[PDB]
Structure formats: structure tokens, C-alpha cells
Symmetry: none
Subunit: 87 residues, 3 copies
């Protein structure tokens, strides 16, 4: 919530995962999430309604994207987290 970055599932584990979610600081409505997916988390953001932990944007990765930066659709993650880190 407080720190920016991404919000990942609990029992998933590190690996390649798709990107479908954007988050706004002052917009609570969000769509549902499915296993093997992540949500882009900005500083001071609501819970994405289906996550349990938030990973730092530093411990991330990039993938090939569109010519006009139209999303990457892949993030990947590095280390294993613990369910519940932000209130």
C-alpha cells in the first residue's frame, strides 16, 4: 500500500508472470485477479482486491514492450515474500 512497486500472490513463488493491472492512489475500484498475475502498485495505493503481499520495484525485471511503450505484459520476480506486509 504505502511503498510502490507490485503486489504478488502468496503461494505462487518466483517466476514469469503477466501484467494486467494498474493502480491509482485515489481510485479504489479494481478488477479481479487470477493466479499467476501481478498488479502495478504506486506509492500510497489501495489493495488490488485479490493480493496479499507487495514486492519492491527494485526486485523486479523488464521485458520487451510495444514501440510506443504500450505496456510490457511481463515483469518476473526474484525473491519469495511473506503473505501480508502492508496495512
Amino acid at each position: 500500500s504505502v511503498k510502490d512497486g507490485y503486489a504478488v500472490r502468496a503461494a505462487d513463488g518466483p517466476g514469469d508472470r503477466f501484467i494486467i493491472g494498474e493502480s491509482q492512489a485515489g481510485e479504489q475500484p479494481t478488477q479481479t485477479v487470477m493466479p499467476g498475475q501481478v498488479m502495478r502498485v504506486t506509492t500510497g495505493a489501495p489493495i488490488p482486491c485479490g493480493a496479499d503481499a507487495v514486492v519492491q520495484v527494485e526486485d523486479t525485471e523488464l521485458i520487451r514492450e510495444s514501440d510506443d511503450g504500450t505496456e510490457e505484459l511481463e515483469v518476473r520476480i526474484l525473491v519469495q515474500a511473506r503473505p501480508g506486509q502492508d496495512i
Copy 2:
């Protein structure tokens, strides 16, 4: 041995087609099969029991739902709840798997029917105990099945899990068989003066059908040097390998060689192998329109026909499709009956056995020729290779080591 190298130096390699995953036990594949989704596509459990958030002691208070066989959309934000996962089911919002309720001291106030309140499991487990993560077996993009191989029985199962119904494999040859000699009648008729029924057609056709290749039967063509041209011309049109039995052993009137040479204009690579009485072994190739075709001319004795068409004919149709190392398998066994040694070497058809006491298998001869008064119930399962006569060594006793071939299931 020069025949074997020559045989595997002119046979081409066929094209490719597209087939379903049901048919295709044995075909070698030509493309590369890639995965499209993970396996499993969601975290699951291996045991059945309770799923509890980590960083907790023996303190739990409530159970909300339980497993099933879909995706369960329910979880409270509180950290003192349990979900009771079964043998195979997603893990909703936790990190610790089945706590082995059958092993720990569990159960609480519960309900009159089928419900529970709490567990209070004293033991604690590491974060991640029995969960199977996403991709523990197959990743999103991976080679799984490579080009080459042979498409065994368990290989079709791997194709189903990935989800590729259509593949690209090599084709099978079409083989046609004909028999020669103007002294043979079909084995469905009463005998006439001075004639013998022909058996080489049936024995050969039942040998190239065990592997699975399609077959076409031509008939019995006369030994005249005229009707052979009218017969081989039909065979060369609707097939790729034509096999002829007997003949050749005439010399002055060896019509088969004449018909092949001054007519179809086909190359004759070799005309005889170094063997004791029994000449006919002719390899030929013909090139029409660009697709090369193979012809053979097997000997006439009923016992030498199987040996010839299992030593350098059977290991030549295999290279035609996809096999990387087409070579017959030679094992080592022991003898169980004294056999005489003639000067030039021969080949005996035998039967193998396996006793669970001593390593090497045991071999029993089943008659060099004639083949009457069959003993034992099991059918022949290979050929036996013998050495030629050498001074004092003119007789082989029981035991020792001999070289045995494999021609069928064992």
C-alpha cells in the same frame, strides 16, 4: 560386411505429413513441439488437511470454506483463519500447506453435522511445505519433446498434457511382394502332377506387417523373361520397395538380370554375398522422375529367405523413415545342445530363454532346415551366428559364448 554398408548408402529418406496424436505409435516426428501453458496452472496441495497462514503458533479460531475442484473466491483479511485444503485443490491466500491433520492433534467444538470450528495445531512448519508451485514440471515455453526420437507409448501421453493435437512426422513406405517360378500354385488348391505350393509369399508378408508398414500383394508371375516386365512395371507404380523370391540361380537363363538391365535401365550394385551354396542376393536401384526406388532379389530356400530379409532388408526400411542408428541388436548367450561345424558358416533359427539364477541367456536350436516336428510351445525369437571350421575346433560343446540376433518380442 561390405553389403551392409552398401545397403545403407543408397536408400533415400521420405517426406513428411500431418497426423493426429492417436495414430502414430512409432512414427518419428519432424517438427519441434513447444509448450503453451504451465503445469500445474495454479498452486495445489499433495496431502489433505489444513491450510494455515504462516508466522502463527497454535492459535487458530475459524474455518470458512474448503477446497473443491475449482477456484475458491473467499478469504478474510484476518490472520486467524483456516481453509482445510484437500488432496488436490488451489491454495487461496496462504503460505503453509496441509499441516497433516491426520497426524497432529486437532478438532474442536465443531457442529452436529459436517462442520468444524478450530484446530489448534501446536507444531509449526516452514513457509512452503507441501504446495506444488506454478511450473514444478513444465514451464511456459520449453522443448519437452525434441526432433528425432521414436514416439514410444509414453510419448503420446506427453503430447496430450501440452495440448498439441497435430504433429508432423515422416511417412511409411509401401512394400509389394511377388514370387517367381513356373512350378508353384496358390495355397488354396489341390495338387497337380509335379507341382509344389509356394510359401515364401506368406512368410514375408507376415514379417513386414508386424512392424506396421502397409503391404500390397501382386501374385505369382511366370519365370518367362517377358511377363516379368509386365509385372514389375505395375509394382513400380503403386509402391516403393518390391521384393522377389527365388530365381536368379540359373546363370545361362538368369532372366531377372536381363530384364532389369536392357529395359528399365537400373543399376545393379552387387549380385552375390560371400556365402556357402545359395547365391541369390541382388540389390538394385532405379531413378525415375526424381524419386529413387529399391528392388531386391532374395534366395529360394525357405530357410534362407527369412535370414536374408532380416539382416539387410529389415534394417533398410527403418532408415527410410526416421531412425538415427538403424542397426540390428546383437546380444550374447550360451548354447544348450551340441552342433556340428561345417566349413563355411551358416545361420540357424533359434529360441531364447531367461532364468533368474545366472546372467547370460540360454539358446536352443530349432533346426537348420526342413523344420519338422516342432518342439517347445514358444515361437522363434532370433537367429544364431556360428563360426567357420578352424583346425582342431570343428565341434562346439555346451556353454561357451555365441552371438544371437533379435527378430521379435523377447
Copy 3:
């Protein structure tokens, strides 16, 4: 071990039929064949290979490609042989989809089917495919009735868990009355399997139940089911084959023994061969471009058998062409 004894002591033997010689590869014989005319019927002696009115091949010996040769030399076009079984296979589990379909939440693809069918269809027997059957008791009842109404042996894969509310055991002793012989046999606790016998106004029928793990399914089929269809054919000895070999690599062992898939090789320099394992459940193997030929039997983890080396000699069961 006692599991194998029970299966061979309750499987029946089918009848007989008349067929042609051409379509007769792999069938055991019922009658006896006698010569009709001497061979050769003229001096080359008058009769040197076959004497007239002498037994050629006996009753109850397996027919091979070489033995079909004699059947045409004498002239007996038609013989009497035992009949082949009909096997129908079904797969349970409410988490399965046909392999020719996309992915929905929490669903995987059928794998044990199309693996059992291919293995049986390799030996020569016909088959009938049923589909995926749910765990509703009404649905399970309908599926089994069709199976016993068009075939003789029924093989079911999956749905052996939930022993408290096992639906398979319920329909086998309430609706369709039948006797269950064994339900969990593996020496020390192993994967479940059930053998059942049902008899209805005549011929007996056998119904099988096999686990859901894709690696242990093939071990069960080639050790119990395969050496039981062959007795129905008429083969005198339906035992499998065991040979001795060395090890291609050194592998760790675990308390309870398990079975692995191995590829058999041979060399021209040493007598005994050695085999290389491929693992129970892994991401296949980039190398070893050959299909499996046997099943390695790892011994139980003893003090001396904590682990094995490349020089140890083991046993293996041939399950394919070598």
C-alpha cells in the same frame, strides 16, 4: 506378491472361432494340424521333409511369422483359435478436460487415457473409448452398465481417493452386485488399486481400478493388467521377463522402493548390458533419443542400499522391443 497370484487364479478363458490363415498372427491354436500330401511329391526321395499323416504343429503353441509358413505348405487354409478380449477404458475425476480444448479455471488435461489405450492397442487387442465420467453416483452407474454390456474388461483411471466417501466401492456392492477381492496391495503402503469380478448368467467379467498418478499408472498396467489379458488368449505361461544389467549412473535411494523408466543399451565389448534411468516425473530428457524399454526396480533403502553406484548390477523388466 500375493496380489499377482489372485489375478491369475480368477481370470477365465474365452471360446474358439474359425478364421483364415492370413489373419492369424498372435493367436494360440485350438485344433491339431496333420499333413495331407507328402513333400516333395516326386523324387528330387519321395517324402523327405514331411511324411503323410504326421503331426506338423501341435495344439496350444503360439503362432509366429515362421510358423504361418507351414500352415500354407500343407494346405490347411482354415484353423480354430481362441478369441481376443475387448477392453474399454474410462477416466474419472471432476477436474479433467478433453485434450483438444482450452483451459478453464482449476482444470487440467487428460493424460492416463490415451496412454492406457495405446499400450493395449500395441499388443493387438481392440478397444472402445468411453470418455470422462463424473463422480455423481447416478452418472457412474450408467457408465459401468454400458461397459459391461459391450466389453469384457473395464479399466478405470483416477478417482481412487476419498476413502471415507469412495463412490467406486459403493456401486460395486449395492447396485451391481459383485465381490471385491483386494483394494490396497503393494507390500508396504502403496497406491490404491482394485480388482473386482462380476458374473451374470454366464461369462465372467473383470473390472479394474488404477491410480491417478501418471507415472505409477504405467507400472500398474504392465505388471498386473498386461500379464492377465494373455491368459485369456491361451498362452500357457503369461509371466513377464526379467533380465540382469548394470547401472549407467549412481542414484540415491529412499526408504520405500519405487519404479523408474529406463532405456536399454547394448555393447559389443562386455557381456551384460547397462541401463540409464529417466526419472519418475521430470521435464523429459534432452538426450537419450530412444523410447523406454523397461522398468527399473530399485531395491528398498537398506544400510548397504543407502545409495547405488555405477558398478552395481540390478534387475529390469522388458516391456518393449529390444
